[PDB]
Amino acid sequence: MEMEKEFEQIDKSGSWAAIYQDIRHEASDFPSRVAKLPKNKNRNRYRDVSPFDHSRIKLHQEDNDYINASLIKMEEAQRSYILTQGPLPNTVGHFWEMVWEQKSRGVVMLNRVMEKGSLKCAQYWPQKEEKEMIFEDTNLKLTLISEDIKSYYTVRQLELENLTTQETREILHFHYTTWPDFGVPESPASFLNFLFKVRESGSLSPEHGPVVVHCSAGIGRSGTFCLADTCLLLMDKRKDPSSVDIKKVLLEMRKFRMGLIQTADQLRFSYLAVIEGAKFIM
């Protein structure tokens, strides 16, 4: 079926939970043996969210190459994304090592450091120009260059230096700051505006490594971001845009990382975002 009318048909029939459970039943299951080794327990935020072995990002290190991060490679859309968990106190150095080694231009953050009164990720970037951060375990230095605070999101320019070679790179940090503590946004308008700002920066483009996107577990809000982007890109590429099937795209993405889209409300919100976004494109 088309999307907008399949949408109204699920709303009127109140069957979002049954659609979402079908997706969960049909999703791929692949091994995640490296994630579960005992030496990696303090590298995982949640015991039930792990990268598959076949698609995990490897750190360029001989001691321990593990990070909770996955490469989602979308062949028809010609987009790639790295989805990862919010960094932990003992993985902030690994996070920036990955950014460096994978040649990423942008980092997309979809959570706040504290939500619901609890810490959802580490404070992994500097808050003042004159107070830079040094990650000694991976030999990197990180400096805040500028910061632009808007009503729904903040953009930061950062300098990342590889202290071993003295090479430097400019990283863009795109921080969506207004996702509600419970549920999903009432309108997709600010999320779409945020997506378009990431696109306009060049961070999603083939002349760079894959964008790094994260929330707390790296599967819910993060999944919503890449699912919406990819579906809109396919609607631009194809002769028949109504042939884009959002459930089939989601199941393709779940071949690369488990659990993408965590609730039926997130699924509905993803439909809403693609539907509204397809009107603005034209």
Ligand X SMILES: COCC(=O)N[C@H](C)c1ccccc1
Q: Which is nearer to ligand X, 50 or 104 (CB)?
A: 104
- If one asks whether residue 151 binds ligand X (CB under 6 A), the answer comes out as no
Q: Which is nearer to ligand X, 203 or 230 (CB)?
A: 203
Q: Which stretch binds ligand X (CB under 6 A): 32-40, 96-104, 154-162, 184-192?
A: 154-162
Binding mask 86-125 for ligand X (x = CB under 6 A): ----------------------------------------
Q: Helix (H, G, I), strand (E, B), or coil: what is residue 144?
A: strand
Q: Helices 16-26 and 3-13 meet at what angle, rounded to 10?
A: 120
Could you give the CA distance from residue 223 to residue 27 in angstroms, rounded to a whole number?
14
21-80 residues near ligand X, rule: CB under 6 A: none
Beta bridge partners of 115: 118
How does 83-120 read in b/e, with b if 16+ C-beta sit within 10 Å?
A: bbbbbbeebbbbbbbbbbbbebbbbbbbbbeebeeeeb
Look up 215 and say whether it is catalytic: yes
The residue from 29, 48, 75, 148 that contacts ligand X (CB under 6 A) is: 148
262 labelled as ligand-binding? yes
Could you give the CA distance from residue 265 to residue 188 in angstroms, rounded to a whole number?
13
Could you give the CA distance from residue 124 to residue 135 in angstroms, rounded to a whole number?
10
181 labelled as ligand-binding? yes
Q: Which stretch binds ligand X (CB under 6 A): 13-21, 55-63, 150-158, 271-279?
A: 150-158
Could you give the CA distance from residue 249 to residue 145 in angstroms, rounded to a whole number?
37
Report the 10 Å Cβ neighbour count for 135: 18
217 labelled as ligand-binding? yes
The residue from 118, 146, 151, 164 that contacts ligand X (CB under 6 A) is: 146
Q: Helix (H, G, I), strand (E, B), or coil: what is residue 108?
A: strand
The alpha carbon of residue 103 and the mean position of all alpha carbons in its chain are separated, in whole angstroms, by 16
155-214 residues near ligand X, rule: CB under 6 A: 155-157
189 labelled as ligand-binding? no
Q: Which is nearer to ligand X, 171 or 273 (CB)?
A: 171
Q: How far is the CB of 147 from ligand X (least distance, A)?
A: 6
218 labelled as ligand-binding? yes
Q: Which is nearer to ligand X, 96 or 153 (CB)?
A: 153
The two tokens of residue 273 are: 């975002």
86 labelled as ligand-binding? no
Q: Among positive and negative, which fits the CA dihedral 88, 91, 97, 103?
A: negative
Q: Which is nearer to ligand X, 105 or 268 (CB)?
A: 105
Please report the beta strands in 131-206, taking only residues with DSSP state E, as ranges in sequence order: 133-135, 140-149, 153-162, 167-176
Of the candidates 46, 24, 33, 168, which has an alpha carbon nearest to the alpha carbon of residue 96?
168
Q: Which stretch binds ligand X (CB under 6 A): 96-104, 151-159, 219-227, 229-237?
A: 151-159
Active-site option among 121, 215, 226, 231: 215
**Total number of residues that touch ligand X (CB under 6 A):** 5
Tell me the catalytic residues.
215
Binding residues for substrate: 181, 215-221, 262
Applying CB under 6 A, which residues contact ligand X?
A: 146, 148, 155-157
Which segments are annotated as binding site? 181, 215-221, 262
